[PDB]
Amino acid sequence: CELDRDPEGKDFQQPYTSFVQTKQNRDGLYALLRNTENPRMHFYQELQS
Amino acid sequence: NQQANAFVNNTEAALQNQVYKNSTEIANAKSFLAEGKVLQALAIWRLM
Amino acid sequence: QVVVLGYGTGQKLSTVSGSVAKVSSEKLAEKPVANIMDALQGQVAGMQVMTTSGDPTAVASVEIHGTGSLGASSAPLYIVDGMQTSLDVVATMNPNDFESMSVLKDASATSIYGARAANGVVFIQTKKGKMSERGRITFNASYGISQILNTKPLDNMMTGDELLDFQVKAGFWGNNQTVQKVKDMILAGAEDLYGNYDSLKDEYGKTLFPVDFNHDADWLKALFKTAPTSQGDISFSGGSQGTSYYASIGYFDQEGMAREPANFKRYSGRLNFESRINEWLKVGANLSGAIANRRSADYFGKYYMGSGTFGVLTMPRYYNPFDVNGDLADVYYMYGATRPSMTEPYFAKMRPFSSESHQANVNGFAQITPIKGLTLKAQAGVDITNTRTSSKRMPNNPYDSTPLGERRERAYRDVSKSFTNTAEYKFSIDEKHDLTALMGHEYIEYEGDVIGASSKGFESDKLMLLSQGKTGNSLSLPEHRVAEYAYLSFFSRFNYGFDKWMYIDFSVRNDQSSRFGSNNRSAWFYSVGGMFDIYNKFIQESNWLSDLRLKMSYGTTGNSEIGNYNHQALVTVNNYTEDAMGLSISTAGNPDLSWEKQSQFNFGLAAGAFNNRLSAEVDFYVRTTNDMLIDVPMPYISGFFSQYQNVGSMKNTGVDLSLKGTIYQNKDWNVYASANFNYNRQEITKLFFGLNKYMLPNTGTIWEIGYPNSFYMAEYAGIDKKTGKQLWYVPGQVDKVTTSQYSADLETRIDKSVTPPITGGFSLGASWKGLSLDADFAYIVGKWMINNDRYFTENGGGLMQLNKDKMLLNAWTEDNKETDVPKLGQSPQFDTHLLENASFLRLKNLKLTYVLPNSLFAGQNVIGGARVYLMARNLLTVTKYKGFDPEAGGNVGKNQYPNSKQYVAGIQLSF
Amino acid sequence: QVVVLGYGTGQKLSTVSGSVAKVSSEKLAEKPVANIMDALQGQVAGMQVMTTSGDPTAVASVEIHGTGSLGASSAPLYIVDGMQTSLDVVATMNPNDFESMSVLKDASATSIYGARAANGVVFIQTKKGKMSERGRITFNASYGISQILNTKPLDNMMTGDELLDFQVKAGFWGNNQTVQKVKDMILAGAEDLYGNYDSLKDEYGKTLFPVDFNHDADWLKALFKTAPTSQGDISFSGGSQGTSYYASIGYFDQEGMAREPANFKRYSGRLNFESRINEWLKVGANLSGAIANRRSADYFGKYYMGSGTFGVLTMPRYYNPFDVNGDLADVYYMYGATRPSMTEPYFAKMRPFSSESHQANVNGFAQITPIKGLTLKAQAGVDITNTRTSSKRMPNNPYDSTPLGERRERAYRDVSKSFTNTAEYKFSIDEKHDLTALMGHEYIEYEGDVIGASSKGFESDKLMLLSQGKTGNSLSLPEHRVAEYAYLSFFSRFNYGFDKWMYIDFSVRNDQSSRFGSNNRSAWFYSVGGMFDIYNKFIQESNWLSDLRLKMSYGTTGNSEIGNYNHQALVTVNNYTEDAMGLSISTAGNPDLSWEKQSQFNFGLAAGAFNNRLSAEVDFYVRTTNDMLIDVPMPYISGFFSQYQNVGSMKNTGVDLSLKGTIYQNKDWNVYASANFNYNRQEITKLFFGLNKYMLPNTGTIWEIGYPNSFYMAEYAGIDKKTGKQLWYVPGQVDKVTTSQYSADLETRIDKSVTPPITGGFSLGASWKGLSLDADFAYIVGKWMINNDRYFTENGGGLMQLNKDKMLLNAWTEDNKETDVPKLGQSPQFDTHLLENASFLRLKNLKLTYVLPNSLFAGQNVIGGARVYLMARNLLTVTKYKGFDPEAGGNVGKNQYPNSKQYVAGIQLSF
Amino acid sequence: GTGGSTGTTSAG
Amino acid sequence: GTGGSTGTTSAG
């Protein structure tokens, strides 16, 4: 009797089971890197000079 | 850094359990993992 | 009495150590509302129940021994002869089929429903039918009316001729305007609005007057009515050698008192059946069904101009929604309106709604007794609900934004199923020792889903299917939601009894679930309890004492009413390019998600005097909750804004007592009385990462360590007689100093708790010769509530077009300088002067019944008896609140649906 | 025996005059399919039943006494102990709960279900449970396998090495091509297609070979398999003084034999209960439920390259769908393909489908007997079905057009309800006269609807909710359909009996309905019937004759299986401008829409000889149908193209007989036999506005006055030995002359009818010592069917890439001039050479059972008996058809699902 | 009824 | 399966 349920409608974090899941998580990581390393985040090292 | 750690650990645990069905997916997933390690190193170097 | 607490056969009631409270079938039946829990306000000691709306489709809120958690739910576990239900499903069951209702509230009664019984458990048992020579038919019928409780806040409001003067002196209409210049032309020019529309172009000034100044209008009759209620039932109860059945078919129709529609209507049936097949087997089945059509008044709890009780209080009295014949018209007029505003029956006619719910319950058990004491029971159950609702918006009505119509269809499906397998063995070791051992297995499973489809752009009333809308831009995405869970469990319980006077029971349970996080999924709970009969051993007889028992217990339970999916790191869409999608983590979960573990220590004693004439019971409990759930704010090394983990602790210490008594005057008179009381004070022991206080964002409360969660607002010190401004106190700086400027640094913790501590109720009844009369009272004292409508009815500046209080006529000015209200150029804030004392005492029902005597049915072999009864529900209410109902709400009293008083009259033929 | 025909209590079986046929519980139970009617092929005389598919979710088609209408339906009225059902709902009921099944087929048996009983009525009665001291438990279990009937059309097909030679000589590959140049490179270049795709780029030529010439492939193993079937049941039957119950829980799983999935699975339960309350009242309830999951093979009846039996016949043998290990691969290869074609398990994996149906039946009656003969009965019933299906199409598979996925959800709801109130009175006037009088009221109501929502554009397998599709252009309108009807009725029936030998009954009924047109909505039906016992009066005793009865009847019935909405002039959308809609009439209706009235005269006699050893029954019937429905073509003054009115007439004259007999050899041996037969010839009496013949457009038949509706095609005269072309006959011009040119003026009426006239069946059984053996045979002779697959498997020119017959190798040419097949440069038409003789004789089931003797269970008080049985269904079939099944179809045999043979083995413990 | 949401209300 | 509807069939 296995009694865990996966949420219908969204995926969650676990080891990967296919290749398209890997490719889509990689695209999401690159879209996170886009907003993390902006020019907007590096103005504070420049204005302190 | 947290989400790069999650991606790299999940791709390593998928490459260890042989979930990829042909050789092109393995030859691409190794490159995807090598792409994630650079983002780990960049996100640690910025804080350092 | 014999109580089945948990599983296995019943023991006794003078043997159990767990402080259960059994409610017999007299207090449940004949009630004229849909919710069955509302008839228990003031009966079971230590359980407060409050219905926060007067809808037919409302559901009461029950809390046993305080509020045990700041973060999760507080409602108990309602199980119905086996498998558990929700209150919306017990509302589709006829309450004449309930034989009893036992409330289990202390550990070593509740602790074999571990991880679900931190808030107690209500155990509803259904009727089984008596074995006799010929069966019996019982036919019930009732009829009643329902109307609003009290019309006291209409005694304070202005009239039309006062509101015009106050509005023109406040400068709302103009700088140099006046009455008979504002009254005559600028707003009695509602013929410029009533002239554009063809349906009422030629009828202004002839058969409907929208603006009328000579006498005010009745907005209570325009927004609330007197609504009927019907109910009937036929029930057959029978038996034979071994086989026993109880069947019933019933109908219950109840209509809401407001003009905006809300009805609850059901047709139900039940067949309980139980028959033993041979010497070692007995089978049985509880089957039930219902077809229920609900509808609920949605615009209550929100502020809309002209609806609810907000529309009775604030809509100005010189507007008139009636015609000249005293009936309600299709539209009324407000000033500056682009379109005329629709009344409530026209808006109910232009926005249809129809729900239909098909409910089935199937419950079956098989019981095998091979050896003299062994009993093996296997029980299965399915609970299926298919709902189907539809709401449209009709095309081509003139008093609207667009002539086009919309439609929406929804289909719901909730399927639950439950399996329980127990094995009991009881045996006596010596002539004076006794043991009972139970062990068993349980499996609970639920899955449910919602599907929805909507369309828009229709131009005909007949061509309103959903595949006849307008394509292109007038079509949207469907609705689709899915939830599910499962529980597995193994439990055990040992009952060791000595000869007469010592009983000791010890129980344990293991629960696993789909909700617990993936690192700790197995939960262990236990309890130990004991009862000592001091009368049967120590003091063998006396003249005044007839019974004396002492009991004590300790147990651990848990509360797995955490969410279905709150322990895992959900990923969502974060696209990188235009062709491929991306997925990124968005909640972070936590694998170490517990079940909100609590532990309860209980000590009590029950006495009985004058040969069971007087009875008393006193109980002292300490209930300590640990590991509560809060969506905490996280440090920055998480990379998230919340983690939603297990932190905190709380404790509730309390005492409750219950007295019952019987008085006489003769051999036919019979008077009795009862009274129960419960005091409960709570405090918050610890919190997050070493915090002392924490206020939940925009709620109005504060969790302070060492106190119950109180109100967190500004203090109010009244006005000054120099300049007439509002003065709030300062937290600290004692001299106390008041400042006229308001900032958010003037807030402090008020010393008034959120949940009411003192809860009780008392009953008194009499009986003469089959004509009886009973009266039940229920009180809650110590309950404060923010009155929100007083933000609008007595503000000086802002929202000036609404009707005000009469106490704005005595406003502060230069020639009138000794009053209690401020000037007119201000805006009141949410502070202590909106907290009101919502403590109340209600007369819950007054019932006068009469059973016709047996000498009247002597030759007739058909009819064997009859009963007639009159009943009045919510007849009186004494309180100090100013908002139509002190019970309807909690922490905030908004535009509310008041509770209703009801008069019913009924017959019951036992033919 | 006692038969309840219609309403009221049962009379007798040697008293009824209406020729009913009662089927006992032996012939219904233990059957391994889902449809219950298919087990009655050859039992009831005059009723032909044919299952036109071998799906688990298929439904048999029943026709009693011919096809009574050209224009409406022919299926009977199936009512189940009261309220009526469909066959899809009896397929969700366990067939071990049926106690009997009586088929009513002549008037004065059927004519109190007037306007519904023109096609007979099947009356299924459920078990009620025997009153005894201790109840009884019965546990059934079965297991079987299922596979395809016959593999005879694979004995005619070409191999790979023959098809290559025939294709290259016919010039399909090239003008100057040859084998070893076509074989080697032009089509073994499937490495140019298998090289683009990453999943099979490195696997061509190593572990899967798509094109293989050295040995052919097995396409029957690639498209059909051997499929299991399971079944179990537990039933409790009990009673007491007055009260009697029968409960049952069961499970039935059946999997389809083709590789494309089709399963039928159900879990069901039943509780029949009946108990008398006092001296004047008896109540009862039949409750049933089911949760059924269907799935059906959709691509059968259509022609797709590589699926069905068309794919077994026509797919060329040098293509290979397996890998080197003998298992089925994901894809195979066809020449000129842009993408590789998916096999059947991969396409079943990429297109999921899931249905779930919740079915409830609730039936209740109350019966009052105040006076010695009076009986007042009131009966209500509800029948509720909620279905919910979902089908998706999975994203990101490589062998498809787009990588995006789709989803579709549907919710169905069918609610039916029925009320019946009768009053019966029976009394004896003298010592030798008797009368019975019944009168009653009936009300039938049905409403049902379908809601559907679809979405598309998904890119992940996990993110497949319906509100996660792509907006903009990838979203469409919902689906929504609603149907409903109602019937009201009042009926009466008088049964006058003389002392022993004369019985006469007379019945009448008035029906009103929502389907009948608004000018004649009230329908009157009647019947009169009589039975005379010639043995009890005329010849009091004899040595060889033991019973002789004569009976005759006349009655009128009707068939209201016209549409729900066919009598009214529907208006639809005809817009004028861009802003407002317009409505214009589009069907014209007719208010004078009748109920297709028919009248039946019946005359029969039943004899029995050698002290009820031999039994015979002969019946002669004339059944005249009037006022049939045809969508007629209208004159131009209508302004429409059709009117859909009541015109025409038909008559069916027939004779059916039934013999039963018993043979012996000793006191323990027991042999018996039965045989029944029915001949039925029909003719069309009149038609439309003075027409003589009328052919329905593109159907293949013709309605000629004076003949049954026959086939309307060209005649075939073979080829000539001069030039080798196809020669069709000419209608007329006798000398007969043949022309080589085909035109549509060469069609005439073939002299072969559509429905088969001669229908029968015979049974034979033996029994020795509890080990018995029975065998039932069923034959239909006179049935012709157009074989459509022979259009593709033996055409000369056109469709050359498919596998052909072997008889195209002996084609007509210059050096081979004495054959029967034409040249290769032609195209065959649909003519007489495609009509085949589909007459068959089947062995329906062979069953060998064994009940264990009573001496083996002597000391054990638990188990009271057991039974073991082996059963083979569809073991032999003798016929002259060439298309895998002669039964599967009618008028056209397309790509069909054959009937399957089955082997089951089962136990039954009566413990 | 509807028309204007007239709100400066507190959270429930 | 699917792919090509290969039809010159008669009406049922």
mmCIF file of C-alpha atoms in Angstrom, chain D residues 404-515:
data_model
loop_
_atom_site.group_PDB
_atom_site.id
_atom_site.type_symbol
_atom_site.label_atom_id
_atom_site.label_comp_id
_atom_site.label_asym_id
_atom_site.label_seq_id
_atom_site.Cartn_x
_atom_site.Cartn_y
_atom_site.Cartn_z
ATOM 1 C CA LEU D 404 2.031 19.547 -28.281
ATOM 2 C CA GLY D 405 -0.688 17.722 -26.395
ATOM 3 C CA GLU D 406 -4.444 17.955 -26.072
ATOM 4 C CA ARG D 407 -7.030 17.068 -23.444
ATOM 5 C CA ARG D 408 -10.802 16.677 -23.327
ATOM 6 C CA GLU D 409 -13.158 16.193 -20.370
ATOM 7 C CA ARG D 410 -16.844 15.227 -20.504
ATOM 8 C CA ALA D 411 -19.572 14.892 -17.859
ATOM 9 C CA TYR D 412 -22.874 13.095 -18.523
ATOM 10 C CA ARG D 413 -26.019 12.937 -16.389
ATOM 11 C CA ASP D 414 -29.111 10.813 -17.128
ATOM 12 C CA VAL D 415 -31.958 10.921 -14.594
ATOM 13 C CA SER D 416 -35.120 8.879 -15.114
ATOM 14 C CA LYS D 417 -38.104 8.447 -12.821
ATOM 15 C CA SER D 418 -41.297 6.429 -12.928
ATOM 16 C CA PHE D 419 -44.526 6.186 -10.933
ATOM 17 C CA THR D 420 -47.159 3.434 -11.095
ATOM 18 C CA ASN D 421 -50.410 3.188 -9.124
ATOM 19 C CA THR D 422 -52.692 0.189 -9.621
ATOM 20 C CA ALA D 423 -55.831 -1.161 -7.953
ATOM 21 C CA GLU D 424 -56.752 -4.828 -8.433
ATOM 22 C CA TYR D 425 -59.918 -6.656 -7.381
ATOM 23 C CA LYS D 426 -60.645 -10.348 -7.938
ATOM 24 C CA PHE D 427 -63.797 -12.205 -6.948
ATOM 25 C CA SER D 428 -65.924 -15.230 -7.802
ATOM 26 C CA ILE D 429 -69.547 -14.577 -8.738
ATOM 27 C CA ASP D 430 -70.773 -18.190 -8.565
ATOM 28 C CA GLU D 431 -69.228 -21.541 -7.737
ATOM 29 C CA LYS D 432 -67.839 -21.701 -11.294
ATOM 30 C CA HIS D 433 -67.400 -18.092 -12.492
ATOM 31 C CA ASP D 434 -64.443 -15.835 -11.759
ATOM 32 C CA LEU D 435 -63.481 -12.237 -12.505
ATOM 33 C CA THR D 436 -60.475 -9.973 -12.036
ATOM 34 C CA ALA D 437 -60.385 -6.230 -12.674
ATOM 35 C CA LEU D 438 -57.318 -3.990 -12.767
ATOM 36 C CA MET D 439 -57.025 -0.262 -13.395
ATOM 37 C CA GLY D 440 -54.078 2.015 -12.942
ATOM 38 C CA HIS D 441 -51.974 5.050 -13.693
ATOM 39 C CA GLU D 442 -48.407 5.420 -14.948
ATOM 40 C CA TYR D 443 -46.000 8.344 -15.381
ATOM 41 C CA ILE D 444 -42.562 8.118 -17.032
ATOM 42 C CA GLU D 445 -40.073 10.967 -17.162
ATOM 43 C CA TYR D 446 -36.525 11.252 -18.507
ATOM 44 C CA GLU D 447 -34.025 14.091 -18.661
ATOM 45 C CA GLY D 448 -30.347 13.950 -19.526
ATOM 46 C CA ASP D 449 -27.481 16.187 -20.535
ATOM 47 C CA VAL D 450 -23.844 16.257 -21.690
ATOM 48 C CA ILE D 451 -21.220 18.901 -20.837
ATOM 49 C CA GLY D 452 -17.781 18.955 -22.409
ATOM 50 C CA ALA D 453 -14.618 21.043 -22.290
ATOM 51 C CA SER D 454 -11.462 20.713 -24.355
ATOM 52 C CA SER D 455 -8.035 22.299 -24.381
ATOM 53 C CA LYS D 456 -4.820 21.997 -26.333
ATOM 54 C CA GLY D 457 -1.248 23.178 -26.550
ATOM 55 C CA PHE D 458 0.467 21.486 -23.619
ATOM 56 C CA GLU D 459 4.218 21.012 -23.473
ATOM 57 C CA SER D 460 4.700 18.940 -20.284
ATOM 58 C CA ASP D 461 3.296 15.627 -19.095
ATOM 59 C CA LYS D 462 2.823 16.805 -15.506
ATOM 60 C CA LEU D 463 1.249 20.173 -16.355
ATOM 61 C CA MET D 464 -1.828 18.699 -18.047
ATOM 62 C CA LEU D 465 -4.713 20.364 -16.278
ATOM 63 C CA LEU D 466 -7.387 21.902 -18.441
ATOM 64 C CA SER D 467 -6.685 25.471 -17.308
ATOM 65 C CA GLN D 468 -3.042 25.238 -18.422
ATOM 66 C CA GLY D 469 -3.481 25.208 -22.190
ATOM 67 C CA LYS D 470 -2.453 27.883 -24.626
ATOM 68 C CA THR D 471 -4.741 30.880 -25.045
ATOM 69 C CA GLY D 472 -5.322 32.955 -28.142
ATOM 70 C CA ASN D 473 -6.103 30.693 -31.081
ATOM 71 C CA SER D 474 -5.704 27.302 -29.370
ATOM 72 C CA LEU D 475 -9.052 27.373 -27.565
ATOM 73 C CA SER D 476 -12.541 26.506 -28.755
ATOM 74 C CA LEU D 477 -16.216 26.371 -27.754
ATOM 75 C CA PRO D 478 -17.560 23.827 -25.233
ATOM 76 C CA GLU D 479 -19.977 20.972 -25.895
ATOM 77 C CA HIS D 480 -23.493 20.935 -24.515
ATOM 78 C CA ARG D 481 -26.476 18.723 -25.359
ATOM 79 C CA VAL D 482 -29.821 18.273 -23.546
ATOM 80 C CA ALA D 483 -32.707 15.838 -24.163
ATOM 81 C CA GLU D 484 -35.895 14.965 -22.244
ATOM 82 C CA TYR D 485 -39.350 13.405 -22.545
ATOM 83 C CA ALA D 486 -42.400 12.363 -20.528
ATOM 84 C CA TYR D 487 -45.326 9.930 -20.758
ATOM 85 C CA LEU D 488 -48.666 9.818 -18.924
ATOM 86 C CA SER D 489 -51.004 6.856 -19.056
ATOM 87 C CA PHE D 490 -54.161 5.227 -17.741
ATOM 88 C CA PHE D 491 -54.838 1.532 -18.299
ATOM 89 C CA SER D 492 -57.373 -1.160 -17.466
ATOM 90 C CA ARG D 493 -57.732 -4.922 -17.874
ATOM 91 C CA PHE D 494 -60.504 -7.455 -17.183
ATOM 92 C CA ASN D 495 -59.933 -11.210 -16.808
ATOM 93 C CA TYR D 496 -63.137 -13.269 -16.949
ATOM 94 C CA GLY D 497 -62.694 -16.972 -16.364
ATOM 95 C CA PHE D 498 -65.203 -19.801 -16.567
ATOM 96 C CA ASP D 499 -64.785 -22.926 -14.387
ATOM 97 C CA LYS D 500 -61.707 -24.652 -15.829
ATOM 98 C CA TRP D 501 -61.766 -24.426 -19.587
ATOM 99 C CA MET D 502 -62.567 -20.910 -20.875
ATOM 100 C CA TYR D 503 -60.567 -17.762 -20.143
ATOM 101 C CA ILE D 504 -61.120 -14.378 -21.799
ATOM 102 C CA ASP D 505 -59.210 -11.165 -21.152
ATOM 103 C CA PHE D 506 -59.810 -7.673 -22.481
ATOM 104 C CA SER D 507 -57.476 -4.717 -21.996
ATOM 105 C CA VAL D 508 -57.344 -1.022 -22.890
ATOM 106 C CA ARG D 509 -54.836 1.804 -22.398
ATOM 107 C CA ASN D 510 -54.638 5.564 -22.989
ATOM 108 C CA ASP D 511 -51.198 7.111 -23.537
ATOM 109 C CA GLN D 512 -50.219 10.760 -23.821
ATOM 110 C CA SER D 513 -46.650 11.812 -24.446
ATOM 111 C CA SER D 514 -44.331 14.712 -25.086
ATOM 112 C CA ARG D 515 -43.281 13.262 -28.442
#
